[PDB]
Design an enzyme around this catalytic site. Structure first.
Site, PDB file in Angstrom:
ATOM      1  N   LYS A  74     -12.857  -2.280   6.316  1.00 51.15           N
ATOM      2  CA  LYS A  74     -13.442  -3.090   5.253  1.00 51.15           C
ATOM      3  C   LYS A  74     -14.373  -4.185   5.863  1.00 51.15           C
ATOM      4  O   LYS A  74     -15.480  -4.373   5.355  1.00 51.15           O
ATOM      5  N   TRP A 102       0.871  -1.177   0.000  1.00 49.02           N
ATOM      6  CA  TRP A 102       0.000   0.000   0.000  1.00 49.02           C
ATOM      7  C   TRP A 102       0.916   1.237   0.000  1.00 49.02           C
ATOM      8  O   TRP A 102       1.879   1.279   0.793  1.00 49.02           O
ATOM      9  CB  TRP A 102      -0.812  -0.096   1.276  1.00 49.02           C
ATOM     10  CG  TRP A 102      -1.787   0.930   1.561  1.00 49.02           C
ATOM     11  CD1 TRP A 102      -2.834   1.341   0.748  1.00 49.02           C
ATOM     12  CD2 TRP A 102      -1.921   1.603   2.776  1.00 49.02           C
ATOM     13  NE1 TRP A 102      -3.553   2.309   1.418  1.00 49.02           N
ATOM     14  CE2 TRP A 102      -3.055   2.439   2.680  1.00 49.02           C
ATOM     15  CE3 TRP A 102      -1.198   1.559   3.964  1.00 49.02           C
ATOM     16  CZ2 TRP A 102      -3.442   3.303   3.756  1.00 49.02           C
ATOM     17  CZ3 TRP A 102      -1.567   2.398   4.996  1.00 49.02           C
ATOM     18  CH2 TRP A 102      -2.686   3.231   4.892  1.00 49.02           C
ATOM     19  N   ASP A 134       0.184  -5.717   9.689  1.00 49.39           N
ATOM     20  CA  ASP A 134      -0.869  -4.805   9.227  1.00 49.39           C
ATOM     21  C   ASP A 134      -2.013  -5.705   8.804  1.00 49.39           C
ATOM     22  O   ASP A 134      -1.866  -6.482   7.854  1.00 49.39           O
ATOM     23  CB  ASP A 134      -0.347  -4.030   8.035  1.00 49.39           C
ATOM     24  CG  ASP A 134      -1.358  -3.030   7.475  1.00 49.39           C
ATOM     25  OD1 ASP A 134      -2.556  -3.332   7.540  1.00 49.39           O
ATOM     26  OD2 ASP A 134      -0.958  -2.061   6.836  1.00 49.39           O
TER      27      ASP A 134
HETATM   28  C1  LIG Z   1      -2.595  -2.875   3.782  1.00 49.28           C
HETATM   29  C2  LIG Z   1      -3.408  -1.735   4.338  1.00 49.28           C
HETATM   30  N1  LIG Z   1      -2.933  -1.014   5.365  1.00 49.28           N
HETATM   31  C3  LIG Z   1      -3.599   0.015   5.917  1.00 49.28           C
HETATM   32  C4  LIG Z   1      -4.851   0.429   5.468  1.00 49.28           C
HETATM   33  C5  LIG Z   1      -5.552   1.594   6.127  1.00 49.28           C
HETATM   34  O1  LIG Z   1      -6.862   1.195   6.527  1.00 49.28           O
HETATM   35  P1  LIG Z   1      -7.890   2.270   7.144  1.00 49.28           P
HETATM   36  O2  LIG Z   1      -6.993   3.331   7.736  1.00 49.28           O
HETATM   37  O3  LIG Z   1      -8.696   2.729   5.952  1.00 49.28           O
HETATM   38  O4  LIG Z   1      -8.675   1.479   8.162  1.00 49.28           O
HETATM   39  C6  LIG Z   1      -5.487  -0.287   4.336  1.00 49.28           C
HETATM   40  C7  LIG Z   1      -6.845   0.117   3.809  1.00 49.28           C
HETATM   41  N2  LIG Z   1      -6.824   1.543   3.443  1.00 49.28           N
HETATM   42  C8  LIG Z   1      -7.149   1.687   2.032  1.00 49.28           C
HETATM   43  C9  LIG Z   1      -8.222   2.487   1.655  1.00 49.28           C
HETATM   44  S1  LIG Z   1      -8.188   2.330  -0.069  1.00 49.28           S
HETATM   45  C10 LIG Z   1      -6.823   1.266  -0.226  1.00 49.28           C
HETATM   46  C11 LIG Z   1      -6.332   0.788  -1.551  1.00 49.28           C
HETATM   47  O5  LIG Z   1      -5.235   0.186  -1.489  1.00 49.28           O
HETATM   48  O6  LIG Z   1      -7.101   1.068  -2.500  1.00 49.28           O
HETATM   49  C12 LIG Z   1      -6.376   1.020   1.073  1.00 49.28           C
HETATM   50  C13 LIG Z   1      -4.733  -1.417   3.749  1.00 49.28           C
HETATM   51  O7  LIG Z   1      -5.235  -2.136   2.707  1.00 49.28           O
END
Ligand SMILES: Cc1ncc(COP(=O)(O)O)c(CNc2csc(C(=O)O)c2)c1O
Ligand SMILES: Cc1ncc(COP(=O)(O)O)c(CNc2csc(C(=O)O)c2)c1O
EC number: 2.6.1.1
Lengths: 379, 379
Positions: free
Chosen positions: A229, A113, A194
């Site tokens: 999610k 990410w 993570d």
């Molecule tokens: C590996 C990983 N680490 C951290 C996050 C952060 O999640 P939230 O902060 O949205 O709960 C996420 C999800 N955040 C996210 C929103 S859109 C997205 C994408 O890759 O499109 C990722 C994740 O897939």
């Protein structure tokens, strides 16, 4: 002061980042609505939570991560802070590590990410990449991964996606996780998991296997988890930073500094979303409805993976895409190049990221044939 | 990794940090409950907000800060990010300044909220104190303030509490704010307003006078505001970081880096509380109910200030406490020493902070006589 600041850098949506149902909507889960109505009826104050948030939320989080009856829980080796999302959990972890330990470097998979680098660099930590992806077999390049990580020194952090690797959907097998757990102990890495997709690969317990293999072997680890999610609670910012140490005295003392890092950031965490999660997880009826909603999402994604492979074959792709069936979660690399992705956007109105990652949850029975026709056109 | 971490440092409650009504409760405001029921009925997704949060929330925030029809708004000179509370707004401001400007130092009043130092130091910024409080007259020591701030260099940030100074309840008069505004322009300070109590001193518009006197004179400023107290939304983490620059091109470019600092912290902000605020502020009926609830809180605090002074006199204090009537918001210094405060806790079960600050909103007609008897006993 501001006059010379440099600007920050930057038909079908498979470039979306959330789950969509078969109608292309991201509705509020029914278990969540029922919990929100319960909170509306029963809350009598908005008085601040403690720095680490709602106690029941922490207990239910540790049970999801480690399993009910885990030694880590029985021995009081883990402390959880409720955070604003998985991202907030990663930043609290980074700020905790930067200020309280000798950590200077975090190892992240190539690819990952993109926000990982931003979060750790914000806290003053360097990010190094380890190899991960074998693009010819569309698989985990395990030998390359291990070879890369041999450059990691004792006391570096190594970040692992707990399941549903983003962007590849390729996860270690249990045996590979066990090999990594052993290697990590031998090399002195601090694991940082993570865990943003628990429940989207095979199931809640199955998806935590890798983390639990690490937890069985390590005195210390950190988990940054997200309910964005798996509860469809994206905008309520619901996550957790779980700190594990060798014993209760040590984790409690270390966690006091994690709480100090939170206090200096956002003081204490947002109640609504986490209270929804705690209400659902601690109630047999709501938890059963929620677990089924999560199973429905996980299964719909699997049906789309299969329908995508079958439809590409029917539309004349003539290329093996079977790797898609075996990958986990919402994301996969399609194997398209950046220029094919650009072509897809410009000529066909089909949107993916430049890496070729697609969100399989953006696919529906209705949009599959045109999507696959477009992809076949650019091969 | 964690084994040598040092631990972080640390009948009637006047040591409380929230508002209490006459029954000693901190209930959810009725305007808030009505807004929450509207959201339960009408939300159809929890999809992520943008990095800067809900647009209507930003517009309504800028109107509260600057006034409807402000040139700052008409000229598009201000950008607002919804944040997790006032604390999150201060940390976003600090991280923005540390990473994107030459700022090294923030000047804070002595005394202030103790978390200011933690937030700015977390971002790598030094905190310096300016004089503020004349303890003999229980007033603003304006000459000392100006003398202290002469040590501030061009390009330092100076933090001002917008109204209801915490802990003293002593605010500059309009003329004093105008003198400070002029001095700040001459000396090249970047003003940072911390505005957590708008509405608790005299009224929404009156309480923004000082900020508006600064805004009329400055090209650039930052405001970190909070809706925790004036909406009773403490635990939902509802605040704003508003960036102002000379013109739209400059503020937009600078704000892109403010958004980058948010993305690397908590990604995007929690919707529930801010959506409640936007729903209330943008609806004539809900806004009228809320404005009256805020007036009721402001007036109850004033009644307690008066009842405290009158009751201390009736209980034989024989000391002037009239300064309490003129101070603003929930907090005042009682003038008790740290040992009198300790005595109050130990002998009488009355709890204040060691500085002698008391939360007047913790006082009720029911608990006033015993409280005042206790205070008279320790004089
Ligand atoms: C590996 C990983 N680490 C951290 C996050 C952060 O999640 P939230 O902060 O949205 O709960 C996420 C999800 N955040 C996210 C929103 S859109 C997205 C994408 O890759 O499109 C990722 C994740 O897939
Ligand atoms: C001057 C000032 N700055 C920032 C804050 C942070 O507000 P929230 O983060 O709670 O919205 C606050 C309010 N935070 C707070 C909670 S208890 C308390 C106290 O001084 O008792 C203060 C404030 O008074």
């Amino acid at each position: 002061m501001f006059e010379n600041i440099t600007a920050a850098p930057a038909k079908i949506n498979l470039g979306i980042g959330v789950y969509k149902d078969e109608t292309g909507k991201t509705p509020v889960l029914t278990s969540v609505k029922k919990a929100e109505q319960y909170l509306l009826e029963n809350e009598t104050t908005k008085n601040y939570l403690g720095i680490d948030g709602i106690p029941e939320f922490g207990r239910c989080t540790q049970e999801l991560l480690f399993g009910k009856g885990s030694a880590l829980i029985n021995d009081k080796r883990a402390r959880t802070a409720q955070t604003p999302g998985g991202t907030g959990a990663l930043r609290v972890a980074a700020d905790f590590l930067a200020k309280n330990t000798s950590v200077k470097r975090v190892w992240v998979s190539n690819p990952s990410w993109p926000n990982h680098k931003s979060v750790f660099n914000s806290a003053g930590l360097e990010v190094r990449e380890y190899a991960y992806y074998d693009a010819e077999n569309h698989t985990l390049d395990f030998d390359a991964l291990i070879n890369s990580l041999n450059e990691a020194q004792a006391g570096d952090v190594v970040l692992f996606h707990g399941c549903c690797h983003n962007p590849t959907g390729i996860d270690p097998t249990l045996e590979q996780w066990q090999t990594l757990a052993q290697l990590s102990v031998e090399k002195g890495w601090l694991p940082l998991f993570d865990f943003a997709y628990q429940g989207f690969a095979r199931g809640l317990e199955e998806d935590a296997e890798g983390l639990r293999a690490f937890a069985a072997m390590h005195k210390e680890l950190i988990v940054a988890s997200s309910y964005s999610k798996n509860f469809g609670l994206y905008n309520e910012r619901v996550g957790a930073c779980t700190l594990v140490a060798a014993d209760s005295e040590t984790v409690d003392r270390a966690f006091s500094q994690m709480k100090a890092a939170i206090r200096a950031n956002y003081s204490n965490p947002p109640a609504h979303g986490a209270s929804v999660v705690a209400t659902i997880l601690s109630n047999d009826a709501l938890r059963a409805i929620w677990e089924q909603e999560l199973t429905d999402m996980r299964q719909r994604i699997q049906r789309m993976r299969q329908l995508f492979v079958n439809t590409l074959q029917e539309k004349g792709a003539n290329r093996d895409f079977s790797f898609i069936i075996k990958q986990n979660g919402m994301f996969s690399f399609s194997g398209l190049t950046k220029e094919q992705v650009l072509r897809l956007r410009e000529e066909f109105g089909v949107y993916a990221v430049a890496s070729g990652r697609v969100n399989v949850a953006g696919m529906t029975p209705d949009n599959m044939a045109p999507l696959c026709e477009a992809i076949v056109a650019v091969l």
